[PDB]
C-alpha cells in the first residue's frame, strides 16, 4: 500500500523543525521565523499541510493555506515547496490536489489563489488560470517595498 500521508502541521509538532528546514532550503530565513508561521496553523485558516510518510521520519512537501481578508470563500496558498531530491516525482501535484480537495470539502471554499515568480508553468499544468493580482490584507496596509512584488504572477483555480 501507499505510505504517503498529508497531515496538518499542528497535529505533528515532531515535524516542525524538518518543515522549517525544508522551506528555509528554498527561501533562507531564521528557524524562528518559519516556526512562527507553522505555529499559527489551525483547523480553519491559516493551515500548513505537510506530506510525510509511514514512520514520519521526514517531510517531503509543504504548503500553507492562508485567509484572504476580502474573500470569505477563498484562500491563498503560499510557501509551496517539495524537498529537492523528491522533485519531479509527482509530490507537488499530490499535495496541491490534496489541498484543493481539503479547501473544497472540509473548509467549504470556492476558489484558491496563489502567486508565483517563475513556476507558473507548473500551476498551469495542474489547472490554474492566470488572473489579476489580489491582496490578502485589508486596505489599512503598508509593507516594506520590494521589486519582487511586481514580478509575481497571480493565478487562481475555481474548485
Amino acid at each position: 500500500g501507499s505510505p504517503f500521508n498529508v497531515v496538518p502541521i499542528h497535529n505533528y509538532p515532531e515535524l516542525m523543525k524538518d518543515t522549517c528546514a525544508l522551506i528555509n532550503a528554498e527561501w533562507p530565513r531564521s528557524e524562528t521565523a518559519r516556526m512562527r508561521s507553522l505555529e499559527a496553523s489551525c483547523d480553519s485558516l491559516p493551515c500548513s499541510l505537510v506530506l510525510t510518510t509511514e514512520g514520519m521520519c521526514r517531510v517531503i512537501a509543504h504548503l500553507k493555506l492562508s485567509p484572504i481578508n476580502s474573500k470569505k470563500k477563498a484562500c491563498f496558498v503560499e510557501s509551496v515547496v517539495v524537498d529537492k531530491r523528491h522533485r519531479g516525482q509527482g509530490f507537488g501535484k499530490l499535495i496541491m490536489k490534496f489541498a484543493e480537495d481539503y479547501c473544497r470539502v472540509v473548509l467549504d471554499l470556492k476558489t484558491i489563489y496563489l502567486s508565483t515568480i517563475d513556476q507558473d508553468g507548473f500551476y498551469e499544468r495542474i489547472g490554474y488560470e492566470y488572473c489579476a493580482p489580489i491582496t490578502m490584507y485589508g486596505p489599512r496596509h503598508c509593507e516594506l517595498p520590494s521589486l519582487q512584488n511586481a514580478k509575481k504572477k497571480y493565478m487562481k483555480k475555481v474548485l
Binding site: 522551506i23 528554498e26 527561501w27 530565513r29 521565523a33 518559519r34 508561521s37 500553507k64 492562508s66 503560499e78 510557501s79 496563489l114 502567486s115 508565483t116 515568480i117 509575481k152
Partner: peptide, 4 residues
Amino acid sequence: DDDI
C-alpha cells in the same frame, strides 16, 4: 511564493 514565500508566505513571509
